[PDB]
Design a protein around this nucleic acid. Structure first.
Ligand SMILES: O=C(O)CCC(=O)C(=O)O
Ligand SMILES: O=C(O)CCC(=O)C(=O)O
Lengths: 213, 86, 213, 84
DNA sequence: ATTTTTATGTATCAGCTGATACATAAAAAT
DNA sequence: ATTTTTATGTATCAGCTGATACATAAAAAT
C-alpha cells in the first residue's frame, strides 16, 4: 500500500532511477524530501573524516527513508550517507508537498506510521545482532536478517539476492574485513553456508534461528 | 521449508496446509509473528495471528492427519509442531 | 510537548504510574496498545531462553513506543521486554481508538510521525555506538547519548540523572559487567568522568563528542 | 557551557548569543543547529543548516572584535574554532 | 541496629580479533 | 585482448576483553 499511496502525491509522481553504487543523498546535503525505495536496496551509512564507513542499516523493498526531513524541514542537513547498494527504483516527494498531502488524505497518514514502525523494528533487530559479543553469532544473526529481506529461495538454502563484498559486510556488523573472510571460511567448512557466483547461501536458516532463542 | 515473500516482514516459511486450502506461515527469524495466508485469484492475502491462536490451528491439523491419513504426513507435521512450539 | 498535549485528549485520559523495576509488557503479550512515556525511563529489552538480556533502546521523556501495535494490531504478540527502569509516568491508548482519532484530527497525525521519526534516528544513533570496535569509544559514545537524554547541568560536568548498574550498562553496549567496571575505572583515572551515589557525571561532553565529527 | 533541552532533540549546548536570541547545537557530534529565543511566554526552537549557522556566528565574531572586549572575542573564536 | 543480599573493585590468563602484510583471484578500466 | 584496479585467501602479531574468581563496598532485608 506504501507503493500505492506514494504514486498519488502530485497528477502522477515520477519514479527515479539510481545506478549501482550511485549515491542518493550525501552528508551535508539539505534534506528536502521523503523517499520510498521500491525496488532493490539502499545503504545508509555514517562516514567519518578518517574515511571509515559504518553501515547504519541496509533497507529493503517498500521501506521509507529520509525520516529526518519530516521533523527537521528543508533547513537541516543530512548526517548519513544514502548509497544505492544495488540498482534501485524509488519515489521522492518534498516534505512540504507531503505534510499538505497528509492532512488532505489521513488514510495515507495511517499507511505511513506503519511504514516507519517497520523501520524502527528493523533497526531494532539490528541492535540485537550487534549486541552480541561472539563475532560468530553476530555474523550469523546478520546473515539471517539478510535472508529475511534480500533472500531468494534456492534449492539447498535461501540465497540473498545481492552482491556483498567482505568489507561491505564488515562495515555492517562492526568489524574488520579480515575477520569477515576468516569467519566466513569457518562457516564454509562447518558447511552452514555456500558462496557461488559471488552470492551467499545459507542452509536451513530456520535451524540457525532456533539457536538464537 | 516452503517460502513466501511478505512485502514488509520479508521472507516467511510455511508451517502446514489446512483443509480449507488456507496455509499457516511464520517469520523467518525467531518465529516472531505468525500469518494465515489465503490464496484468492488476486488475493494472496495475509492474516496475522498470535502464537497461542497459531498452536491450536496446527493442533487440529495434527488430529485430522493421523486418523484419515499416512503416519508420515502426521509425523512430518509433528516435527514442525515439535520444533515450532515445544 | 504537542505529543504530550494530543495524547491527553484521548473525556480526558488519566496517566499510568509504573514503580521502579515493574514491567509494562512482557514478551508474548497481545500488542494492542501505543504508549507515550511522559517522564522517567523505559527499558526495552530482548530476552533469550538462556535468560540473558539485550537492551534495544533506553527511552526518554516524550518518546513513543509499543510501535508493533500499529502494524498488526491486537492480533500479534510482543517479543521485547518493556521495563520501567526508573519511576515512570506514561499514557496508553488502544491502537483502534487511535487509528480513528488519526483521521479525525490531522494535526495529531503529523505529531505522531515526528515522534516515531525521532525513535528511528535515536535507534539508529545506537547502531553507530555499538558499531564501534573499540569498547572504549563505544562506552563513551553511549555515555554521550545518556547525557543527551537524561543529562542535567552539574557545575563540573553534565550528570545523567539516572542510576546505572554496571550490568545494566553491560547489557546496553554488548559487553560484560567486569569490563564495564574495568573501563569506568580507566575513565576515572583519565579524569573524564566522576561517580557519586551511582550518578555518572561527564566533564565537557562537548569535547568528547568532538572525536566523532 | 550553557545547556538547554529541546524535547524531541534532547540536550543542546549554546554556541553564541546574537543580542538576546541564542544559537544552540545538538550534543552528539553537532548534527543539528537550533536558533532559540528566550521569550517570556516559553522558549522557541528553530533548526538551521550548518552552512548558514556558520555565517550567523561569523558576523557576531567581527562585532565582538570591533566594538567590544578582547576576552569575549577570543572565547567565541574558541567555540567557532572548535565547531569548525 | 544487625544481617545478608546486591553492587563494585580487583586479580588472572587465555584466546579471539584487530592490525598489518601479502598472495592470489576476480573485476574493472583502459 | 592488455593493464590495473578491487576482492579474496592466507600469514603474523599484540592486545584487548571475555571468563572466572576473589575482595570490598553499598544496599536491601531482617
Ligand atoms: O533522514 C535522514 O536523512 C537520515 C536517516 C534516514 O534516511 C532514515 O532513517 O530513513
Ligand atoms: O512494538 C513492540 O511491540 C515492541 C517494540 C516497541 O515497543 C517499540 O519499538 O517501542
Amino acid at each position: 500500500s506504501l507503493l500505492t499511496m506514494f504514486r498519488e502525491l502530485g497528477l502522477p509522481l515520477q519514479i527515479e532511477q539510481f545506478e549501482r553504487g550511485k549515491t542518493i543523498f550525501f552528508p551535508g546535503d539539505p534534506a528536502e524530501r521523503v523517499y520510498l525505495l521500491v525496488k532493490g536496496a539502499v545503504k545508509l551509512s555514517r562516514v567519518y573524516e578518517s574515511g571509515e564507513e559504518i553501515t547504519v542499516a541496509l533497507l529493503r523493498e517498500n521501506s521509507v527513508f529520509g525520516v529526518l526531513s519530516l521533523l527537521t524541514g528543508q533547513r537541516s542537513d543530512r548526517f548519513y550517507h544514502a548509497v544505492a547498494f544495488t540498482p534501485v527504483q524509488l519515489f521522492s516527494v518534498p516534505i512540504e508537498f507531503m505534510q499538505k498531502a497528509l492532512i488532505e488524505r489521513p488514510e495515507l497518514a495511517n499507511v505511513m506510521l506503519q511504514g516507519l514502525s517497520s523501520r524502527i523494528l528493523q533497526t531494532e533487530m539490528m541492535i540485537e545482532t550487534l549486541a552480541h559479543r561472539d563475532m560468530g553469532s553476530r555474523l550469523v544473526s546478520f546473515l539471517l536478517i539478510l535472508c529475511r529481506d534480500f533472500g531468494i529461495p534456492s534449492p539447498d538454502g535461501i540465497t540473498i539476492d545481492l552482491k556483498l563484498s567482505h568489507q561491505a559486510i564488515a562495515e555492517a556488523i562492526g568489524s574488520t574485513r579480515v575477520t569477515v573472510t576468516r569467519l566466513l571460511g569457518d562457516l564454509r567448512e562447518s558447511k552452514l553456508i555456500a558462496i557461488h557466483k559471488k552470492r551467499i547461501t545459507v542452509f536451513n536458516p530456520v535451524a540457525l534461528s532456533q539457536q538464537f532463542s | 521449508e516452503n517460502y513466501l515473500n511478505h512485502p514488509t516482514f520479508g521472507l516467511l516459511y510455511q508451517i502446514c496446509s489446512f483443509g480449507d486450502s488456507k496455509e499457516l506461515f511464520a517469520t523467518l527469524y525467531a518465529q516472531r509473528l505468525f500469518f494465515l495466508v489465503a490464496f484468492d485469484a488476486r488475493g494472496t492475502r495475509f492474516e496475522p495471528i498470535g502464537r497461542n491462536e497459531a498452536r491450536m490451528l496446527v493442533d487440529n491439523r495434527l488430529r485430522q492427519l493421523r486418523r484419515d491419513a499416512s503416519l508420515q504426513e502426521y509425523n512430518q507435521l509433528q516435527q514442525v509442531f515439535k520444533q515450532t512450539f515445544l
